[PDB]
Design a protein around this ligand. Structure first.
Ligand code: ZN
Lengths: 28, 273
């Protein structure tokens, strides 16, 4: 499982099984 | 050609063209039996029919009831005639609908609001009996007299509830009508904001969410980006819990569910294949 699409003039690919970190505000 | 239909207490402009027999397509007005969905040439004809007609709701099994609101599950093979009429009906008001004749390989889920006369047609969605691509919705329609009332959402929500109880993820049949791309986009936001509200942990996979909600992982990634919650910093992919949307979601929760336009898993009485 590998999806593809865009985030702010870059190109990005992401797995649907890796845990993704949830954050709020913070330094980035 | 056809321009209006008498459907129960309603008189509806028709939006497109439906492959009704030319005998009828020659007419500018069709009179529909609001319960069995037979189409008729005139008001006098209909009235005599209504005096004979026995349906006070659709056929099939009532798999959900919550007070007046029901949903019936009609087998295209078990009621070939009722389902064929339904398609013709839906083909007005639905621009790109394919099937009319061969309704056998399909299940139809028909939502209805009951009053003292009977259970009136709100809207429906059809579902392939064996979708090669795991589509949980083939075609979906809210009747015009029920539009802009939050019943579309109820239909969509019910389609995934089936998927849940079937222990499946699914998605509507592509392509998506211009009107239906907005409501799914909307519904996938309700669903996702709710999940993030209830989820207290520090990380999650799409597959987890996909499994909880029955929404397809692609439609999940899609919405996350639509909401601009998929962020990439320092070499990985992070989910960005936007306070605003989440806070707006809670205020919008009050509004909606004050008017009872919510489906209710406790009221479903269904078994999947
Ligand atoms: Zn009838």
């Amino acid at each position: 499982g590998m999806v593809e699409i865009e985030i702010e003039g870059r190109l990005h690919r992401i797995s649907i099984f890796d845990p993704l970190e949830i954050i709020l505000e913070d330094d980035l | 050609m056809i321009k209006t239909i008498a459907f129960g207490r309603y008189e509806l402009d028709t939006w497109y063209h439906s492959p009704y027999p030319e005998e009828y397509a020659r007419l500018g007005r069709l009179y529909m039996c609001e319960f069995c969905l037979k189409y008729m040439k005139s008001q006098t004809i209909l009235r005599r029919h209504m005096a004979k007609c026995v349906w006070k709701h659709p056929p099939g099994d009532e798999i959900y009831r919550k007070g007046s609101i029901s949903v019936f599950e009609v087998d295209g093979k078990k009621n070939k005639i009722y389902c064929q009429n339904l398609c013709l009906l839906a083909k007005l008001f639905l621009d790109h609908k394919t099937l009319y004749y061969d309704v056998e390989p399909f299940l139809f889920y028909v939502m209805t609001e009951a009053d003292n006369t009977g259970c009136h047609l709100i809207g429906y969605f059809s579902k392939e009996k064996n979708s090669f691509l795991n589509y949980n919705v083939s075609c979906i329609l809210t009747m015009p007299q029920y539009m802009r009332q939050g019943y579309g959402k109820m239909l969509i929500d019910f389609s995934y509830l089936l998927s849940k109880v079937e222990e499946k993820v699914g998605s509507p049949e592509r392509p998506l009508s211009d009107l239906g791309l907005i409501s799914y986009r909307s519904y996938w936001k309700e669903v996702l904001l709710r999940y993030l509200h209830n989820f207290q942990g520090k990380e999650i996979s799409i597959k987890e969410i996909s499994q909880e909600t029955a929404v397809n992982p692609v439609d999940i990634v899609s919405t996350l980006q639509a909401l601009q919650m998929l962020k990439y910093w320092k070499g990985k992919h992070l989910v960005l819990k936007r306070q605003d949307l989440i806070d707006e979601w809670i205020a919008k929760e009050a509004k909606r569910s004050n008017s009872n336009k919510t489906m209710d898993p406790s009221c479903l009485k269904w078994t999947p294949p």
